[PDB]
Amino acid sequence: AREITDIKQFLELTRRADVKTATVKINKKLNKAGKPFRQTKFKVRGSSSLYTLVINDAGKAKKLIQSLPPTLKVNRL
Amino acid sequence: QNRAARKNRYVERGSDVVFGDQDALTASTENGVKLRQTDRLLDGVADGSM
Amino acid sequence: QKIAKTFTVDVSSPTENGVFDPASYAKYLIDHIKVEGAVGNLGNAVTVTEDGTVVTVVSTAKFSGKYLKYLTKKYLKKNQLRDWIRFVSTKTNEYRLAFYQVTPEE
Amino acid sequence: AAQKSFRIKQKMAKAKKQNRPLPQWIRLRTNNTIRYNAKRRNWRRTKMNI
Amino acid sequence: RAHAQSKREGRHSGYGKRKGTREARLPSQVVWIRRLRVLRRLLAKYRDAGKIDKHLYHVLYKE
RNA sequence: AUAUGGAUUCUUCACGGUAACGUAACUGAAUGUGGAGACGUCGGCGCGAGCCCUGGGAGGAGUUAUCUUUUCUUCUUAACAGCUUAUCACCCCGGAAUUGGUUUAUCCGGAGAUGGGGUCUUAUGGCUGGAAGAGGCCAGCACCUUUGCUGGCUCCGGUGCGCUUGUGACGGCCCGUGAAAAUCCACAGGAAGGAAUAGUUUUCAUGCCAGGUCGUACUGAUAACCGCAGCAGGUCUCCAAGGUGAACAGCCUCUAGUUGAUAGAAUAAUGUAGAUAAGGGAAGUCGGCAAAAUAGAUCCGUAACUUCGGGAUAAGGAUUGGCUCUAAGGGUCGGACGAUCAACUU
RNA sequence: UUCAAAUGAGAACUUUGAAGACUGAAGUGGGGAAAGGUUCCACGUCAACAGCAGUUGGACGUGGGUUAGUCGAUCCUAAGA
Numbered sequence: 103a104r105e106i107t108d109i110k111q112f113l114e115l116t117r118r119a120d121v122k123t124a125t126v127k128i129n130k131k132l133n134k135a136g137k138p139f140r141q142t143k144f145k146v147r148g149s150s151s152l153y154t155l156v157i158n159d160a161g162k163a164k165k166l167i168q169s170l171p172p173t174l175k176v177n178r179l
Numbered sequence: 180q181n182r183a184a185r186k187n188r189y190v191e192r193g194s195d196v197v198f199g200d201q202d203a204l205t206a207s208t209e210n211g212v213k214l215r216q217t218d219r220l221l222d223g224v225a226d227g228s229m
Numbered sequence: 230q231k232i233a234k235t236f237t238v239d240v241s242s243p244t245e246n247g248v249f250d251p252a253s254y255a256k257y258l259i260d261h262i263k264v265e266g267a268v269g270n271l272g273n274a275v276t277v278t279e280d281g282t283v284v285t286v287v288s289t290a291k292f293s294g295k296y297l298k299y300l301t302k303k304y305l306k307k308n309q310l311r312d313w314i315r316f317v318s319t320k321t322n323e324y325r326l327a328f329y330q331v332t333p334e335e
Numbered sequence: 336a337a338q339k340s341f342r343i344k345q346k347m348a349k350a351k352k353q354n355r356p357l358p359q360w361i362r363l364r365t366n367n368t369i370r371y372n373a374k375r376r377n378w379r380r381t382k383m384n385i
Numbered sequence: 386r387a388h389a390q391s392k393r394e395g396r397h398s399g400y401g402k403r404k405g406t407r408e409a410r411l412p413s414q415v416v417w418i419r420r421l422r423v424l425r426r427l428l429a430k431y432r433d434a435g436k437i438d439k440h441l442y443h444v445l446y447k448e
Numbered sequence: 449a450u451a452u453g454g455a456u457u458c459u460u461c462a463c464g465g466u467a468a469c470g471u472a473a474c475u476g477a478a479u480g481u482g483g484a485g486a487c488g489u490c491g492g493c494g495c496g497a498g499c500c501c502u503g504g505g506a507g508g509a510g511u512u513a514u515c516u517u518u519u520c521u522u523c524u525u526a527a528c529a530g531c532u533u534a535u536c537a538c539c540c541c542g543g544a545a546u547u548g549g550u551u552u553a554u555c556c557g558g559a560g561a562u563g564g565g566g567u568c569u570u571a572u573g574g575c576u577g578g579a580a581g582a583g584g585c586c587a588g589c590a591c592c593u594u595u596g597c598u599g600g601c602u603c604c605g606g607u608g609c610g611c612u613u614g615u616g617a618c619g620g621c622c623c624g625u626g627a628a629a630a631u632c633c634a635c636a637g638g639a640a641g642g643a644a645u646a647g648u649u650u651u652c653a654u655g656c657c658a659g660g661u662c663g664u665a666c667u668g669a670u671a672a673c674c675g676c677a678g679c680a681g682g683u684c685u686c687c688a689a690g691g692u693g694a695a696c697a698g699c700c701u702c703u704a705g706u707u708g709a710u711a712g713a714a715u716a717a718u719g720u721a722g723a724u725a726a727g728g729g730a731a732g733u734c735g736g737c738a739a740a741a742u743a744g745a746u747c748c749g750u751a752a753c754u755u756c757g758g759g760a761u762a763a764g765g766a767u768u769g770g771c772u773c774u775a776a777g778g779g780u781c782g783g784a785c786g787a788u789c790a791a792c793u794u
Numbered sequence: 795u796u797c798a799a800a801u802g803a804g805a806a807c808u809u810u811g812a813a814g815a816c817u818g819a820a821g822u823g824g825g826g827a828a829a830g831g832u833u834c835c836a837c838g839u840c841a842a843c844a845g846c847a848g849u850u851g852g853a854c855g856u857g858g859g860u861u862a863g864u865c866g867a868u869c870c871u872a873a874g875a
Contacts, residue, residue, distance in 0.1 A: 103578040104529060120655060127581075135604090143579095149655065151529080154577065179581070183333040192592075210856045211838025218856050223360025263517060294506070296517045306512050318507065319587070320600070327587095336829060338866075341662050347831055354832090356855080378672075378833055379852075388691085389501095392792075394772095401768035404744050405694035411793050415609045416777095418493080418552045423778070425550095434783090439562090443548065630870040663867075665860045666834045670822095671844100672852060673829045678844070684827065688819050696820060704823050707795080707816070710846040711806065 103152045112144065112155045116171055120149045125177040126167065142166075231289045236297055238284045239325035243314060249326070255279040257304045264290045294322060301326075343385060350376065350383055 106112055115121060127143040142163040145154045157163050170176055210218040243249030259277040260269055274290035286297070301316045317327050339347075357372050376383065391397060403410070428445055431437040437445075 105531095105577040118654075125581095127579095129580080132603095143577095152578075156577080180333060184335050187333060187335070189592080194592090207838080209838080212856060213837085216857060219355065220359050220855070223358055224363070229363070291517080293504090293517070298507095299517070302510095303512065303516095311512085317587075318600095321506070336831070337664070337666085337826085339663060339831090343831090344663080351832070377853095378831060379678085382830075395792095396771075397769095398793090399768065399770095400746055403694095403746080403768085406745075407794085409694035412609065414492080414552070416793085419609085419778080421552065439548075440546070446550080627873100628871060659863045661868090663860100664862095664865095666832075667830085667852095668826080668828090672831095672833050678852085683829100686825075688821100688823100699818105701818075703819095704821100705817080706822055707814100708807100708822100 103154065106153055106155050109155075112146075112153070113169070115146055115148070115153055116174060118148075121146055121174065123147050123175045123177065124170065127179060233287050233289045234292065234322065235285065235287045236292075236294060236322050237324065238286075238297070238301070238316075239282065239319075240284060241282050241325070242328060243326050244281070248310065249308075249314070251279045251281055251284055254301075254304060255284055257307075258284075258286065258300060261300055261303070262292070262296075264292075294318070294324070297324070346383075346385060 106115075116124070124144070124146045127145060129141045129143065130138060131141050133139050139158065140160050140163075142157050142160075143154060144157070144166060145152060157166060167176075210221060212218050240249060240251050240254065244251060255277055259271070259275075262268070262271060262275060262277075264271055264274050271290075275286060275288045275292065277284070277286050279285075286292075298316045302311065305311045305314055305316075313329060313331075314326050315329060316324060318324050353374075354376055355372075356375065357369070361367065361369065388397070407413075425446075428437070428442055432439060432442045
């Protein structure tokens, strides 16, 4: 497994054309120790390794789901 | 109690009528084996007299 | 600073049958609870208040859900209601007395 | 043992298949001298010495 | 726990209860090494904070 | 096997840092040289892991004649990957007697110490990915069914001459100085090979294909091995909880595992194993044989002889429970003191 | 060691439950090497064996069960052959 920070690098992996399936994941966590917030994790099945991208904000998460290609298979939770 | 007692009791199905008193359809063969299995004592001889 | 903690014991299924009563239970709690030593000190650290369906206790002072469960089973043994009633948590700080399984006789 | 040769294993296999009592259809034959299996083995009683 | 709590107070400690040599109970070398390290790093922080000078530090180190 | 991406090249075979060295890359045949593989035991000292001990909160179980904010239990995180981290060692600046630094252990410095600023290994630890979807602990519905179905919580800390183990840097020991080879890598060398209209790099990245043969159950012993046996015998090794205590001694417990050894009824003599005994105290016996007595720890004290190391725990004395106190012995941070946190020794 | 129920013609010895104890992490625990070779597990079943018994079994009868690029062997050398 291999984390990615950058958003541009994730969009390259989706167009790489070995990646048959992706999967989205949603987790409840608590920031600092103040309040809850809804994390997301966009994982993508490479041939060798599993690349993943942790987005904390819920607003940026929902635009990212649309920003995936339609031809790629996507799988919720 | 009486709510439970009137809920729990049963219609008695068809299988109870035919197989209440009955038992042992296809009796237990002498080796104690399943239908496809083989038993090399009694594969050779066919019949209970022999 | 101190930050209060509501705890809510339902007693519906015992009370409707009439083995149990909220009034003696709310009477039993309010004296037997201990803060900072010993019994019978508790002005405004806690406030035990029955409705009838649900009993409610709210504590700015040191108090826990296990200590509430402790004092209930202490009370239930006093009435010989252990073996037939048990203290349960449905949600966090949200408790209710439920009868055990109990088969029908017939 | 639990780390056998193939050859040692091969001889256990022959020893397993030989380990059986007499088929009952052989009792019934014309001029049956043979009554029981006289070269039967058991793990406790006799060590096969590989 | 109750026996451990009385041992913290200084109870069940006396000559009757003890069945080991002083070294077996607490080694003499450990008592030295605790002590000598403590006297060492006292003199370290006095030197660098500059209560004591370096010439007197060198004498007290060997003492 | 190759093919795209990146890098490199018209100064063809990368740049940066004073330097230790650094980075995603950054041609290389013969031959040669070097490292890894590659290694004793003992001793303490540091660091890590697992276990032990311990507090708050969220669940579950037991106790409740009287007392107990109580007793027990669950709250977990793999290989692998990417960032980051350490003793030793090394580099630069600078020039030390009024000699300084420093380990539990006294070794180091004009062959350049102390000091200040760096570079490196990544055992090990940390942080995210793996990964909560898993696992664990609870709650509630459907019901002849060989059946599903749905909710929660899974959190935040602390302590140490602790135990087991791994590793580090040191020290002791010898007329003992404690394997080899496969395999892999590096360095020196430069045979030669590559561009300006497109080549060179498959030790950077991603992608494609493939991985045969044989062993794999179970016991490992007061019934599976060897003693003619389902024989009180013999047979190599790993894991290893709580208390008492110096202790992997003995004694009692938790997890796990047994409850197997022909039974029943009486309680004669003689036995086997084990105890006690008035007064005397070896009169017993070939012979104090066998029992008895002594025993742990602390303090006082300790002869002859001696190869000066010993003899020595010589001998011989005074003590030890329980409780409630007093006294001394540390750490942590920010500049004469003050706050706060902890160990079991005397 | 004891009490009940179940099974069965038959129970001091099988099974489940209820009690009382033991081994007491240098184990009557959990895994392996040598050696054994199916003893593992299920169903059926008691003539003989289990120095009493037996409905029980490592017994008797019939079956099922051991899946590897990564754990081993294979490869390397040791004393030696």
